[PDB]
Design a protein around this motif. Structure first.
Motif, short mmCIF file in Angstrom:
data_model
loop_
_atom_site.label_atom_id
_atom_site.label_comp_id
_atom_site.label_asym_id
_atom_site.label_seq_id
_atom_site.Cartn_x
_atom_site.Cartn_y
_atom_site.Cartn_z
N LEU A 1 -55.63 4.78 62.71
CA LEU A 1 -55.31 5.59 61.55
C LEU A 1 -54.24 4.92 60.69
CD1 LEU A 1 -55.29 9.23 63.00
CD2 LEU A 1 -57.12 7.99 61.84
N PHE A 2 -54.45 4.95 59.37
CA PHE A 2 -53.51 4.35 58.44
C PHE A 2 -52.38 5.32 58.10
CE2 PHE A 2 -52.39 1.17 55.32
CZ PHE A 2 -51.69 1.88 54.37
N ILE A 3 -51.22 5.11 58.71
CA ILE A 3 -50.07 5.97 58.48
C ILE A 3 -49.08 5.31 57.52
CG2 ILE A 3 -48.28 7.38 59.55
CD1 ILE A 3 -51.03 8.09 60.49
N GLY A 4 -49.02 5.81 56.29
CA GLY A 4 -48.11 5.26 55.30
C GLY A 4 -47.10 6.28 54.82
N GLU B 1 -44.45 8.14 69.33
CA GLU B 1 -44.03 9.46 69.79
C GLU B 1 -44.28 10.51 68.71
OE1 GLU B 1 -40.28 11.19 69.88
OE2 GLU B 1 -40.03 11.09 72.06
N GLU B 2 -43.59 10.37 67.59
CA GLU B 2 -43.73 11.31 66.48
C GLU B 2 -45.20 11.59 66.19
OE1 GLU B 2 -40.61 9.75 66.73
OE2 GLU B 2 -40.40 11.92 67.01
N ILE B 3 -46.07 10.68 66.62
CA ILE B 3 -47.51 10.83 66.41
C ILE B 3 -48.16 11.54 67.59
CG2 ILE B 3 -49.70 9.61 66.30
CD1 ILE B 3 -47.90 9.88 63.70
N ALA B 4 -47.71 11.20 68.80
CA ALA B 4 -48.25 11.81 70.01
C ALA B 4 -48.14 13.33 69.96
CB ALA B 4 -47.54 11.26 71.24
N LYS B 5 -47.37 13.83 69.01
CA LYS B 5 -47.18 15.27 68.85
C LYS B 5 -48.01 15.80 67.69
CE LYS B 5 -42.66 14.48 68.78
NZ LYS B 5 -41.31 15.11 68.74
N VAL B 6 -47.90 15.14 66.54
CA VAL B 6 -48.65 15.55 65.35
C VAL B 6 -50.15 15.39 65.56
CG1 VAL B 6 -46.70 14.75 63.98
CG2 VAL B 6 -48.76 13.33 64.19
N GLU C 1 -52.97 14.61 68.81
CA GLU C 1 -53.26 14.40 70.23
C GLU C 1 -54.48 13.50 70.41
OE1 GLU C 1 -53.40 17.57 73.07
OE2 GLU C 1 -51.70 18.62 72.15
N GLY C 2 -54.32 12.45 71.20
CA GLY C 2 -55.41 11.53 71.44
C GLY C 2 -55.07 10.10 71.06
N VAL C 3 -53.78 9.84 70.87
CA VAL C 3 -53.32 8.50 70.50
C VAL C 3 -53.13 7.63 71.73
CG1 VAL C 3 -51.99 9.75 68.75
CG2 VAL C 3 -50.81 8.65 70.67
N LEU C 4 -53.65 6.41 71.67
CA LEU C 4 -53.54 5.47 72.78
C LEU C 4 -52.28 4.62 72.64
CD1 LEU C 4 -55.42 5.23 75.17
CD2 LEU C 4 -56.40 3.17 74.14
N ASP C 5 -52.10 4.02 71.47
CA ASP C 5 -50.94 3.18 71.21
C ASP C 5 -50.74 2.97 69.71
OD1 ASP C 5 -48.74 1.84 72.15
OD2 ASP C 5 -49.76 -0.09 72.37
N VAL C 6 -49.54 2.54 69.34
CA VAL C 6 -49.22 2.31 67.93
C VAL C 6 -48.91 0.84 67.68
CG1 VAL C 6 -47.46 2.64 66.17
CG2 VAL C 6 -48.41 4.62 67.36
N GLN D 1 -44.59 16.22 58.36
CA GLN D 1 -43.76 15.11 57.92
C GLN D 1 -43.05 14.46 59.11
OE1 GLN D 1 -41.43 17.46 54.92
NE2 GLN D 1 -42.36 16.05 53.45
N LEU D 2 -42.72 13.18 58.96
CA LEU D 2 -42.05 12.44 60.02
C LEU D 2 -40.59 12.18 59.66
CD1 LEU D 2 -44.81 9.82 60.91
CD2 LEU D 2 -44.29 11.98 62.06
N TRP D 3 -39.68 12.75 60.45
CA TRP D 3 -38.25 12.58 60.22
C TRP D 3 -37.86 13.11 58.84
CZ3 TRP D 3 -41.43 8.18 61.05
CH2 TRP D 3 -41.58 7.83 62.40
#
Length: 109
Positions: free
Chosen positions: A11-14, A27-32, A34-39, A78-80
């Motif tokens: 996923l393109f996170i900008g 982390e901030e993504i593992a919450k927003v 579910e189903g993330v393997l790695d960043v 939103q992130l942070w």
């Protein structure tokens, strides 16, 4: 060398602060979502080198990402405290031809 590279899903996170590292982003993504393997982070041996404000999120399940974007697409999360947007990384896959029965091993036809 036609485009495609049909495989994993990212996923393109900008729209994120550089002060953060792939470690935090994940982390901030593992919450927003579910189903993330790695960043993954794109930068020259340094995230805060080219002043890049983005990160890549790989999802084990091809859908885990498709349904994970529809959650941040509207920018509801939103992130942070910083606004973020989700875009389809892969520009053009080989879905047109083969989109069903997704297989990762042509070993045996």
């Amino acid at each position: 060398g036609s485009s495609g590279s049909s495989g994993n899903c990212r996923l393109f996170i900008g729209g994120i602060p550089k002060m953060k590292k792939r470690e935090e982003i994940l982390e901030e993504i593992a919450k927003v979502t579910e189903g993330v393997l790695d960043v993954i982070v794109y930068a020259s041996a340094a995230d805060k080198m080219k002043n890049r404000g983005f990160a890549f999120v790989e999802y084990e399940s091809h859908r885990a990402a498709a349904m994970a974007r529809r959650k941040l697409m509207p920018g509801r999360i939103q992130l942070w405290g910083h606004q973020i947007a989700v875009d389809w990384a892969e520009p053009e896959i080989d879905v047109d031809e083969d989109v069903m029965e997704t297989v990762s091993g042509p070993s045996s036809g």
